[PDB]
Each structure stands twice: as structure tokens, then as C-alpha cells.
Design a protein around this nucleic acid. Structure first.
Lengths: 466, 245
DNA sequence: AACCT
DNA sequence: TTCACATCTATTAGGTT
RNA sequence: AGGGCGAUUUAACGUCCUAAGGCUGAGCUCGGCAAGGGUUAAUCUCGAUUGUUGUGUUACGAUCGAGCGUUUCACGUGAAAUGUAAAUAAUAGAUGUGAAG
């Protein structure tokens, strides 16, 4: 359904007009930074006070009623009638009501109506209270209050009150927000793409210098202009190089139809020679990765990372914050984006293979286990990223994703199914001890995973578990 | 400089006695968690109600600024006429009544703060079913010190939300509550509890532990406030804090 | 461009 | 004391002066 | 040797700047200084038809040809598209582990 496209932007005007708009943007990020924290504080205090105030008294009333029913039922049991356990529960419930009566006495003192004064004075009018921070554009209050009201409800549903998790602590990097119908696309005389944005200067879309290599963005922007691709709430954020980037969020309606063979499923595995090999279920295969690229680029990446680590630890402070922060941010972004790109590569190839031969369902070895992390090339990898992208692209094309247990996957024949030790006697090939089946190890593993139908969902529900 | 030493403890006695001791400790830690939440919330309301603004006061000061700018620009543009004269007379009397309303609402907020300060915030007599008396004294000292630092770090201006307190928090214990001596080393504690240190050999550590415990039993170093908590494995870890002057 | 919800 | 990564939640405003 | 810069992310190629893996400021404290070139191009050789800004500025490309290297399909050969190659869902918090004084 929803999707996000990243676009680089620029300001129209003189040299000094850039300074004003850049300061405007920075200040409108800072204001939102402050507003989110204030709203969180107010709502947390209110909802703690509600349960910490009279809710305690009604809880005590319910507790006392249930306890009196319990001793009443206990008394009934005693009558029917061991007696020792009966007297024990009696003395227990006794001291219970005792302390409970102290609680009820202390909660009925009625010294103040704190809940109502706070509810009327701040929380019911949080919109106007937020105006203490000078929002240059005053309508952003609605976005902040909507986000805060939804976030507190979700966090409360997660278990905020019981003491499991802490209160959110939004950081200064939080991007600016824009409304949905607050971005208007219009063609320019020079055939650029211009966006009208309130309270200041409009925006041009940097869309290449030569139109040969950027036709995909042009199609999306056109579909937006004619309104086929609905626009939703977006954001604005600076990179480390002060380039304005707009996380244009699109709500694409998905209505394409792809007929699929009923019951045809695929399977994936992470071999030591193929980063992700795959096959069908019902002479079809498609290797995806190549060792001679991944293992040769990641090696130098981590090597130079360790080199700079040695350099910074050797230096007295590494000249401090400047170089430390520069190296930290540079490597962090570089490695995270490299991993993101390669996960896109693998997932996209898998889904493209699935859709080319009209697959209907996908099965693959369950991730995140203690196994399936070892005996794999991606020995330290963001497995959850690929896990997410495969489900994304599968649901985008009407494909379901299910996981199966990985036991006996490496050393089980996919033709007869016998389980014996050493059946993978050759690393580069597989020979069956019973039916004499001669296929490669990767293909046998993929066929095995495709054939299986024991779907599991949680780690604890496995044949082997610790 | 103060330092923290992590120790693992065990308690002896009958099995039922062990169950009673552990239930008591768990319930006391639950009570301390609840007390921290109560105190932090009440003191946060106290600090919000005084320094920060209110709901309708801003709703009125915005109208006041609007009227002031309206009058200013009308005066600027003016330099048949009776309509404008009556208009700015109406505006000025509206400004006067708006100022009166703002003053009375600010007085309302200030008197609410004065009334709440001693009635419900000077000392919290609100009761959690504590099974000990001194635990209230430790709780208040911990909330009061925390907000002072947290507010100075920008909590008042909106640069950080309030500090929530989680269950996993250690059970605070007074320094005088626990006493330790050798009979192995036993941890004499309040409520008639005498814990026993494991002292058993470990691959990573638990060899210098004997040395430091022998050093501290000699009376060389004084014991400061410490903490007691459970772990992912039930071991009653004592986050002992030993301070060296 | 703001307020209300 | 202060920085990194892996798993896992929910989200992406409408109507009206 | 690192980094900008080529619509964004990776790796290589192209061109520029440097011990910014620096220096300089003000009152133990806080800030500033870099990057296509110029009409044959900023990422295949060349051919034809064409432009655009006007000068060291926010205002250098389009269309047919060939050659040149790629991917896929049938029986090394033939067909298509490609123009460095592979991608294009992105934020925010919470909880879990590591490293460095």
C-alpha cells in the first residue's frame, strides 16, 4: 500500500535568500523537537495521575469486595466441612482488609481535586499551551498533537504503566513534518518540477541533467501531478552534507492482477557458496548472490573500519569531537546503507524470480535462530531487514510468506527423504545412499525446503530447542 | 572516588523461611517502585503548575496581542471618522477587560500552586503498604535529587521528558541496614535476615572478591548506600557500593 | 493560515 | 561515560472558517 | 590517502581540495574557512541533423547512424534492450549486546 520515495530539493532565489529559508527550516525543526517532548510530559503526567489518584480508591473498593466474597466463600466452605487451612486463609484475608482499610482511609481524605484541575487547565487545552514555543508556522500544532495523542495510546497499550518500558525521549535529529495537501507540484517554464511550500520560498526538484537515466522518477512525479498517486504526509531532513531531502510518501493503489499456479511454492537457503540460492516445488533454479563480490567488498570495508579504530584509539583523543563524530557518522551511514542495498538486492531478486514464473506462495528457512546464523555466509547480518523486505514485496504482489523449521535441511535427500549422517559426503555435490540421486547440494537443500509443510512461528516451537 | 562492586548472595534457613523471605523482598521492591512513581508524578505536577503557563491564559494573551497590533496598525494608517473612533474605543475597553481577565487567571494559578504546595507536596503522607518505615525516607531523597538534575538538563524547557521508573529498579537499602562478618561471610540485615556470600570460584571473577571483602571487613573502608536487585537468573545480586575517601 | 477534533 | 548493531512495535489529518 | 562533485544508496571509473586525519576566532566555555569546465560535454570511438545559456552566476542537452561491451531466448551462431554495474519503503522509539577513557 503505502510507499516512500526520496527526492533532493533546492531553493529558488538569490545567494542571501538561501540563508533565510535555511534558518526557517532549522527553526521549524527545533520547535517540533521541543513540542513533542512537552506533549509527552503532559500526557504521561495526566495518565499516571488518573490511576495514582481516585483510581486507587476504586481499585481498593473492588479489592475489598472480592476479598469479602472470598472469606464469605471461605466461611461457607468451613460450614460445609482442612479447618487449619481455612483459619489460615481467614487470618490472611483479615490482615489484607486491615492494610486495605488503611489504604482506603488514606485515599478518602479529599484534600484536593487534582485530576479535574489539571484536566481542565492543561490537557484539554494542550493545543494552546504548546503556543509557549514560537511556532513560526502555527498550524504544525495539529500535527504534533495528533502524533503525540496516537503515540501515547500505543505506548500505553504496550505496557508503559506497569514499569516495563520508559517514556519516549525524542532526539534533536527528528525531521520536520509537512501536511498532505501542503505540497503542490506544478510544471515550470524550463520544464523543471516546482513545489509550492507555504510561508517562504518554493522548491525545485533536482531531476538529473540528462533525462536518459532518470525516467522512473519522472513517471512517478507525473502520476502525482495527474493525481493517480495520492500524496500523504511527508518529511524534510538534511543529510550530513546539508542537502535538503524530502521523504515524499506515496499511497499507491495496487490493482494489478497476476494469476498464480495453485500450490506452487518456492524455497530459499543460505549456503556457503550462494548467498541465497532458491528453487521451485512442482528443472528450475536461480542462483542469486556471488561470493567474489560480497566477501571481497565487506572484507575491505571491515578492514578499513578496524584501521580507523586503531588510529583513533592510538591518538590522544583522536583530536576529539570533530574527528570522532566525523568517522563515527561516516562509517555508520556507509555500512548501514551498504547492508540495506544488499538486502534489497537479495529480496528483489527472490521476488522477481517468484513473480516471473507465477509463484503463489513462498516458504523459506526461519531466520533469527541460533542456527541459520552460523553455517551461512551472512555470518553477521541484518537478517530482520531481509525478513521485512521479503514480506513487503510479497504482499505487494499478492504472495504469502511462511517459515519452516531448519532441522535436517543440510543432510536429507530431497527425492527419497531418508535421514543419514554423512549423506552430504561431498561439499560440492550430493549423492543419495539409497536411490543414487545426483544433484548439487544447494539444489537439494532448496528442494527440501520447498517440499516441507511444517510451518512454525515462534522459536520455542522447534524440533530442537534450548 | 566511589565505586560499585557486584556480588551474588544466598540466604539459608528452612525452605518455607526462604519462601517467606523472598516473597517479602519481592513485595518490598514492588512497593518501592510504586513509591517512586507517586513521588515523581506529584513533584512534576508541582513544577509544571508554577513556572509554566496555563490553558486559557494563552488563549487570552493571544487575543490581547491581536488587539494591540490591530490598534497599532489602525493608528499608523489613520495618520466618516466617528465609526473608527467608536471602533478603537471598543478595542481599548476590550483590552482593559482582557488585562483584568489575564490578571485574575494568573492569580488563580498562583494561589492554586501555593495551596497545593504544603497540602499535598510538602511531605507525601499518601500510603503504600510498606512493610518497613525507613523506605519512605530513602524514596524521597532519591526523587528530590533526580528532578533537580533532570530539570537543569532542560526538562523544564521541553528538551527531555520526565524520568519514568521501571520495576527492574533495585530495592534501595540503607547503609546501616546490612552488616557483614565471617562465621564464609554472612550478611546480617534488617528484618532478622542474615545472607551468605557465595564467594565461589568463577572463571572471569570472584577471586578479587575475597580480597576486597577481607579488606572491607577489617574496617579500613566505610560502606555507603547500596542497592539490592534480582537478575534474569534469580540470584539476589547485591549492587554493593563501596566508597573510598 | 489557524482551530477543533 | 559514551558511542556502535540486532529484534520488534505502529505510523503516514479532515473539516471548517 | 581521505573527501566533495556528478537526481539518492553501494562498488569501480572521471575531475578538483588537502597534513580541515588542520588552522584561525571570542569570553575553564562557545564558532568560522573544499571541491566539474566553459563551449567538443560531468561516465564508450566516431557520423549526420540540432541546439541552450553569456561568460568566469542560482537560468549544457535533444534525434538518427554506425561501430564497441554487456543480459536474456532457440540451435559457438541468431534475435532484443541496454550506455559503468546492481538497486530504489522511509522514518521514530523501546528492549536486548558489544567497543573505546
Amino acid at each position: 500500500m503505502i510507499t516512500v520515495r526520496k527526492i533532493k530539493l533546492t531553493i529558488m532565489g538569490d545567494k542571501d535568500t538561501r540563508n533565510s529559508q535555511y534558518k526557517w527550516i532549522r527553526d521549524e525543526q527545533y520547535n517540533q523537537y521541543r513540542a513533542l517532548n512537552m506533549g509527552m510530559t503532559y500526557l504521561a503526567v495526566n495518565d499516571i495521575l488518573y490511576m495514582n489518584e481516585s483510581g486507587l480508591e476504586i481499585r481498593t473498593i473492588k479489592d475489598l469486595k472480592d476479598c469479602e466474597k472470598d472469606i464469605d466463600k471461605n466461611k461457607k466452605e468451613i460450614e460445609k466441612l482442612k479447618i487449619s487451612l481455612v483459619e489460615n486463609k481467614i487470618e490472611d484475608y483479615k490482615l489484607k482488609i486491615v492494610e486495605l482499610n488503611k489504604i482506603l482511609e488514606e485515599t478518602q481524605k479529599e484534600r484536593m481535586d487534582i485530576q479535574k484541575e489539571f484536566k481542565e487547565k492543561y490537557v484539554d487545552d494542550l493545543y494552546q499551551v504548546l503556543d509557549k514555543i514560537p511556532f513560526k508556522h502555527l498550524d504544525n500544532k495539529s500535527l504534533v498533537t495528533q502524533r503525540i495523542k496516537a503515540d501515547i495510546k500505543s505506548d500505553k497499550s504496550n505496557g508503559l504503566l506497569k514499569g516495563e518500558r520508559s517514556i519516549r525521549n525524542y532526539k534533536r535529529n527528528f525531521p520536520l513534518m509537512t501536511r498532505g495537501r501542503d505540497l503542490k507540484f506544478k510544471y515550470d517554464d524550463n520544464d523543471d518540477i516546482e513545489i509550492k511550500w507555504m510561508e517562504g520560498i518554493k522548491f525545485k526538484v533536482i531531476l538529473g541533467n540528462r533525462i536518459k537515466n532518470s525516467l522512473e522518477l519522472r513517471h512517478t512525479l507525473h502520476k502525482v501531478i495527474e493525481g493517480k498517486y495520492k500524496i500523504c504526509d511527508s518529511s524534510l531532513q538534511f543529510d550530513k552534507n546539508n542537502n535538503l531531502i524530502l521523504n515524499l510518501t506515496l499511497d499507491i493503489p495496487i490493482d494489478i492482477v497476476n494469476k498464480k499456479v495453485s500450490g506452487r511454492v518456492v524455497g530459499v537457503d543460505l549456503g556457503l557458496k550462494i548467498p541465497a540460492y532458491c528453487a521451485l516445488n512442482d528443472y528450475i533454479k536461480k542462483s542469486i548472490g556471488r561470493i567474489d563480490d560480497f566477501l571481497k567488498v565487506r572484507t575491505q570495508m571491515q578492514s578499513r573500519r578496524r584501521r580507523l579504530q586503531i588510529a583513533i584509539q592510538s591518538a590522544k583523543g583522536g583530536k576529539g569531537r570533530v574527528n570522532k563524530l566525523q568517522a563515527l557518522e561516516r562509517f555508520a551511514e556507509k555500512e548501514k546503507n551498504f547492508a540495506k542495498t544488499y538486502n534489497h538486492f537479495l529480496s528483489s531478486n527472490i521476488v522477481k524470480f517468484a513473480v516471473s514464473n507465477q509463484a503463489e506462495q513462498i516458504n523459506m528457512e526461519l531466520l533469527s535462530l541460533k542456527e541459520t546464523q552460523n553455517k551461512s555466509i551472512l555470518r553477521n547480518w541484518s537478517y530482520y531487514q531481509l525478513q521485512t523486505m521479503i514480506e513487503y514485496k510479497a504482499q505487494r504482489e499478492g504472495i504469502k510468506v511462511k517459515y519452516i523449521d531448519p532441522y535436517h535441511t543440510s543432510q536429507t535427500c530431497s527425492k527419497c527423504g531418508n535421514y543419514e549422517e554423512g549423506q552430504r559426503e561431498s561439499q560440492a555435490d550430493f549423492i543419495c545412499k539409497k536411490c543414487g540421486y545426483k544433484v548439487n547440494a544447494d539444489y537439494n537443500a532448496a528442494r527440501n525446503i520447498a517440499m516441507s509443510n511444517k510451518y512454525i512461528t515462534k522459536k520455542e516451537e522447534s524440533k530442537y530447542y534450548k | 572516588m566511589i565505586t560499585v562492586r557486584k556480588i551474588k548472595l544466598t540466604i539459608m534457613g528452612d525452605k518455607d523461611t526462604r519462601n517467606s523471605q523472598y516473597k517479602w523482598i519481592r513485595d518490598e521492591q514492588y512497593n518501592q517502585y510504586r513509591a517512586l512513581n507517586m513521588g515523581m508524578t506529584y513533584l512534576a505536577v508541582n513544577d509544571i503548575l508554577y513556572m509554566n503557563e496555563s490553558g486559557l491564559e494563552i488563549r487570552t494573551i493571544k487575543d490581547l496581542k491581536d488587539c494591540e497590533k490591530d490598534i497599532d496598525k489602525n493608528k499608523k494608517e489613520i495618520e466618516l471618522v466617528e465609526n473608527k473612533i467608536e471602533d478603537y474605543k471598543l478595542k481599548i475597553v476590550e483590552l482593559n477587560k482582557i488585562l483584568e481577565e489575564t490578571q485574575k487567571e494568573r492569580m488563580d494559578i498562583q494561589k492554586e500552586f501555593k495551596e497545593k504546595y504544603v497540602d499535598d507536596l510538602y511531605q507525601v503522607l499518601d500510603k503504600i503498604p510498606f512493610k518497613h518505615l525507613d523506605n519512605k525516607s530513602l524514596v524521597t531523597q532519591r526523587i528530590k535529587a533526580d528532578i533537580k538534575s533532570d530539570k537543569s538538563n532542560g526538562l523544564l524547557k521541553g528538551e527531555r521528558s520526565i524520568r519514568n521508573y521501571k520495576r527492574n529498579f533495585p530495592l534501595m537499602t540503607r547503609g546501616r541496614d546490612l552488616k557483614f562478618k565471617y562465621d564464609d561471610i554472612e550478611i546480617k540485615w534488617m528484618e532478622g535476615i542474615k545472607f551468605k556470600v557465595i564467594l565461589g570460584n568463577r572463571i572471569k571473577n570472584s577471586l578479587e572478591l575475597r580480597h576486597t571483602l577481607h579488606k572491607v571487613i577489617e574496617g579500613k573502608y566505610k560502606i555507603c548506600d547500596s542497592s539490592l536487585q534480582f537478575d534474569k537468573n534469580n540470584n539476589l545480586i547485591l549492587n554493593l557500593t563501596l566508597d573510598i575517601p
